[PDB]
Amino acid sequence: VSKIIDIKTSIIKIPLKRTFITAVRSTNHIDSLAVELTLDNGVKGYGVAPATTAITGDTLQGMQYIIREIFAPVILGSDLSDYKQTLELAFKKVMFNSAAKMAIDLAYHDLLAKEQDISVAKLLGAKANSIVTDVSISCGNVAETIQNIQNGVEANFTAIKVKTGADFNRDIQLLKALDNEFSKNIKFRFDANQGWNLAQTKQFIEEINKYSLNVEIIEQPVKYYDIKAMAEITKFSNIPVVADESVFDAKDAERVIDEQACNMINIKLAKTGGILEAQKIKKLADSAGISCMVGCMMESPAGILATASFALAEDITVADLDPLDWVAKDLYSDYITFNEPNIILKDNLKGFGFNLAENLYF
Amino acid sequence: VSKIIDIKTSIIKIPLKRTFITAVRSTNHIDSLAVELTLDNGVKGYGVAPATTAITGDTLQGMQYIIREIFAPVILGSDLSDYKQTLELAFKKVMFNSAAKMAIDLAYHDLLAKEQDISVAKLLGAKANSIVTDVSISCGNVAETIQNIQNGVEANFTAIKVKTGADFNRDIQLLKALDNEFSKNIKFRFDANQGWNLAQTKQFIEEINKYSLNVEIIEQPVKYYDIKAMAEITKFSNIPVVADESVFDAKDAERVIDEQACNMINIKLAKTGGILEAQKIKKLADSAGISCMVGCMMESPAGILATASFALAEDITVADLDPLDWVAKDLYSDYITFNEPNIILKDNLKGFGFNLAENLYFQS
Ligand SMILES: O=C(O)/C=C/C(=O)O
Ligand SMILES: [Mg+2]
């Protein structure tokens, strides 16, 4: 039987086509750690995860140490077929650092798929190859935001993720401008990234209802830990409420289900620590009648591919996967065609379908 | 008006005299990161935090990067007196990594006290200089466990923290041996490190009550996130239930208070990310009528001194501060008198008094 006999890691930095600015940070590149697992039959698997320290607490340096010194001793010499057990044993030695776990989990799935000579998407049960993404619009003044949205529509996106929560007055006034400039064929997804309080959230919802807008979701309006407010907003709202930072893992999902704190969960592999835990969330959500979407960090097209593979296998059609729009096409053109707004997996790939040759070998 | 003009770090590795084993992990050593903040008047201040990856997720490598590349740009050039808003802005850039935050928070407190020519304990409002600690006992077979406790008793410890949760059958059998070997002048504290399930915890508490033992606390019997079981256990138990891993920060404290999920919170600076957040927890607990104790990771004496200084200032008298007993005396004797089981702060130290630059080479 196949055993994992080697583990390597590599830091990969990808340039962005434009400056990416968040509440805490500004950057021109993506930081990623890649891991390579080698079987004793020569087959190599790969996984790639972002270090988004502000969200998951991961750092490249921490991930590298965790994988080399903590996970590796558990993994080396183990049978591939025992992966579920090996991963449970390995991950229980580390609190948090979900992105480090993601990299390992993905590499394992790459191995499992390659051993069957299929794609990871196929391994996971996917049939369809294509998923629609929104385009993500950064915070800004009303004028430039309206323009950014217009560029998105002209680029063929009909689903628009509008970031809010930085300036509440701006968020409210934006609604008037949206109602004037756009019809109901454009659908909006707001993500406040924890920036609103309870009263503000209610106001924003009421304000939406004063206009005629197609608004699909209100995402993470309040602090990740204020589950009471999330439940109250979910009850108050006529628009589906999405838990993002409130849900990393299956036990977080259990809490928001128990407390009725959202209508939909935004699953991100960098939060879940990869595909196994993401599957557990989807299963819990299905049982509870809670819908799921998929999302990502500003991260490698490799992570996007893994996420799209998971969503296609899980019948998740709502996706915020835009980072492909931020990087050079030739980075992903071997495994993905992005014909906006469609992310389309290429045919006949083995495993995920990307290799690290340039980073690891050249 | 003093301004922070440099930030440097050094790794510290310390060997343990004996093996530390809990339900979560086993180790013979402590890995820590020390940070040094330099003021423009030349005064330096220090903090030290453990990398206990299985508990706080911190690593030496992540801590180094966070402190030098993430926190440092926010801190460098800032006025010392701006510490509260500087730490708030810096800490917002990093989710988790509470031990990295502890190191920086402690270094700031060292500076604050030094600038007033007093000890940190004095800065925080302490009156007393002495706190009593238990000694903790590694998971192991019954015979070796009894021997370790006997060692502790002969060393003058009367409060004994017994690690459980690794082997439940052993845990139950041990109670019989304790009852046979020790009087009620010995006070036991059980800590399962999350290792039991709900049914086991109830059975253990029932078993305790079949014997004659002086049992002070049952600590974190179940998973950190099973707040429902913690509440059920708290309501079932005649013994105070302590939340440890269930409470890192003030918002965790609010949750366990709201859900009646413990009788007491074990405050650790490596979980809170330092003194400022630990003070917020204590205040919430006081308002809720919930008691606090202080605890630690298996960590350097520098973290122990910082924690004792906080406890003394907050009128916290219940302490699991034992790592001094696991390491060479000469590591702490500059700043602490440990007349077991009493941790006594030395007189007339400025700031904490760690004296780290003497033994460590700090680099930016
Ligand atoms: O593993 C440690 O460092 C400490 C654990 C505890 O005392 O709870
Ligand atoms: Mg979001």
Within 8 A of A61 by CB-CB distance, chain B residues are 59, 61-62, 64-65
Residues A250, A280: Cα–Cα separation, whole Å: 6
Q: Give helix A98-115 / helix A83-91 axis angle, nearest 10°.
A: 170
**Residue minimizing CA distance to atom 4 of ligand 1:** B297
**Experimental approach:** X-ray
For the CA of B245, the nearest atom of ligand 1:
8
Question: Taking the CB of residue B6, how many other CB atoms lie within 10 A of it?
Answer: 15
Give B12-42 as a DSSP string: EEEEEEEEEE-SS-EEEEEEEEEEEEEETTS
Residues B16, B322: Cα–Cα separation, whole Å: 12
Q: A95 and B59 in contact by Cβ < 8 A?
A: no
Give the number of beta-carbon pairs within 8 Å between A and B: 68
Within 8 A of A65 by CB-CB distance, chain B residues are 59-62
Evaluate the omega torsion of the peptide bond into residue A341 and state whether it is cis, within 30 degrees of 0. yes
Architecture per CATH, domain A1-116, reads as 2-Layer Sandwich (3.30)
Structure tokens at B171: 């845990």
Alpha helices in A49-167 (DSSP H): 53-56, 60-65, 72-75, 83-91, 98-115, 120-124, 142-154
Question: Taking the CB of residue A79, how many other CB atoms lie within 10 A of it?
Answer: 12
Resolution for this model in angstroms, one decimal place?
Answer: 2.0
Q: A54 and B95 in contact by Cβ < 8 A?
A: yes
Within 8 A of B225 by CB-CB distance, chain A residues are 251, 255
Question: Taking the CB of residue A170, how many other CB atoms lie within 10 A of it?
Answer: 15
Residues B363, A320: Cα–Cα separation, whole Å: 42
Where along chain B do the CATH 3.30.390.10 domains lie?
A: 1-116
Residues A147, A149: Cα–Cα separation, whole Å: 5
Evaluate whether A319 touches A132 at the Cβ level (below 8 Å): yes
Out of B60, B66, B96, closest to residue A96 by CB = B96
Question: Taking the CB of residue A1, how many other CB atoms lie within 10 A of it?
Answer: 9
CA distances from A246 to A160, A194, A215, A251, A268 (A): 22, 10, 21, 11, 12
Where along chain A do the CATH 3.20.20.120 domains lie?
A: 117-362
Where along chain B do the CATH 3.20.20.120 domains lie?
A: 117-364
3-state SS assignment for residue A215: strand
Which CATH number describes the domain made up of A117-362? Answer: 3.20.20.120
Residues A341, A152: Cα–Cα separation, whole Å: 10
**Residue minimizing CA distance to atom 5 of ligand 1:** B297
Look-up: residue for tokens 């993430």?
A: B70
Q: A96 and B57 in contact by Cβ < 8 A?
A: yes
Q: Which residues are bridge partners to A35 per DSSP?
A: A9, A47
Q: B70 and A93 in contact by Cβ < 8 A?
A: no
Q: Give helix B168-181 / helix B198-208 axis angle, nearest 10°.
A: 10
Structure tokens at A278: 């993401």
Evaluate whether A241 touches A235 at the Cβ level (below 8 Å): no
Which CATH number describes the domain made up of B117-364? Answer: 3.20.20.120
